[PDB]
Amino acid sequence: RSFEILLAEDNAVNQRLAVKILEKYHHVVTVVGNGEEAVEAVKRKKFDVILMDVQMPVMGGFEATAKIREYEASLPTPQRTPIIALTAHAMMGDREKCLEAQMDEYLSKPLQQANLIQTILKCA
Ligand SMILES: [Mg+2]
């Protein structure tokens, strides 16, 4: 049921929307505002699923994902946390690109509740 979610999203407005949805379904959300902070969070705590904005200041979702996969591999007991890409843009082989970038699923913004919750359940 209840999941620990890392949300990386640079836009404050979008952070609040996503948190409202996720908390409505009893999830526990850690919110960060860039890719560097997401990498730092993954080193400190195990999450059930990561929601990762593609375009972010300081460090984007593709770069952060690469670092996360490398770190989680380097562990004595390796782990792999699923990552869902969040993108405003959509529909032209984006999902494959995301999957090539080592992400698991994609969601277009603005986030749709049904899709968000079902994709988390698919992943976690
Ligand atoms: Mg962004």
Residue numbers in the entry: 1097 to 1220
The authors write:
If the HK incorporates a REC domain (REC-1) is denoted as hybrid histidine kinase (hHK), and the first His-Asp phosphotransfer event occurs in the same polypeptide chain. Then, HPt protein containing a phosphorylatable His shuffles the phosphoryl group from the phosphorylatable Asp in the REC-1 domain to the phosphorylatable Asp in the REC domain of an RR (REC-2) in two more phosphotransfer steps. In fungi, the HPt accepts the phosphoryl group from REC-1 domains of various hHKs upstream of the signaling pathway and forwards it downstream to REC-2 domains present in at least two conserved RRs, Ssk1 and Skn7. Also, we have obtained the crystal structures of Ct_HPt alone and in complex with REChHK6 bound to the phosphomimetic BeF3−, as well as the crystal structures of REChHK3 and RECCa_Sln1.
We obtained the structure of REChHK3, which contained one molecule in the AU, and we superposed it into REChHK6. Both structures demonstrated overall structural similarity (rmsd value of 1.4 Å for 116 residues aligned), although, α3 and loop α3–β4 were longer in REChHK3. In REChHK3 the Mg2+ ion was stabilized in the active center by interactions with the phosphorylatable D1149, residue D1106 in loop β1–α1, the main chain carbonyl oxygen of Q1151 in loop β3–α3 and two water molecules. Also, the conformation of loop β4–α4 seemed highly mobile with scarce electron density, as observed in REChHK6, and the conformation between both REC-1 domains was different affecting to the spatial position of α4. Meanwhile, a closer inspection of the active center for REChHK3 allowed us to observe that the C-terminal of the highly conserved β4, containing the motif LTA comprised by the conserved Thr (T1183), formed a hydrogen bond (distance ~ 3 Å) with the C-terminal of β3. Specifically, this bond involved the main chain carbonyl oxygen (O) of Leu in β4 (L1182) and the main chain nitrogen (N) of the residue after the phosphorylatable D1149 (Asp + 1) in β3 (OLeu-NAsp+1 distance). Superposed REChHK3 in the complex revealed close contacts with Ct_HPt just for two residues located in α1 which had flexible long side chains (R1112 and K1161); thus, recognition of REC-1 domains seems to involve subtle conformational changes. The absence of the Leu-Thr switch was observed in the structures of REChHK3 and RECCal_Sln1 which were found bound just to Mg2+ion, although we added phosphomimetic in our crystallization mixture. Meanwhile, REChHK3 showed a monomeric species and a small amount of oligomer that we could assign to a trimer, detected in the crystal by the PISA server (buried area of 3935.6 Å2 and a ΔGdiss of 38.9 kcal/mol indicating stability), which shifted to monomer in the presence of PAM.
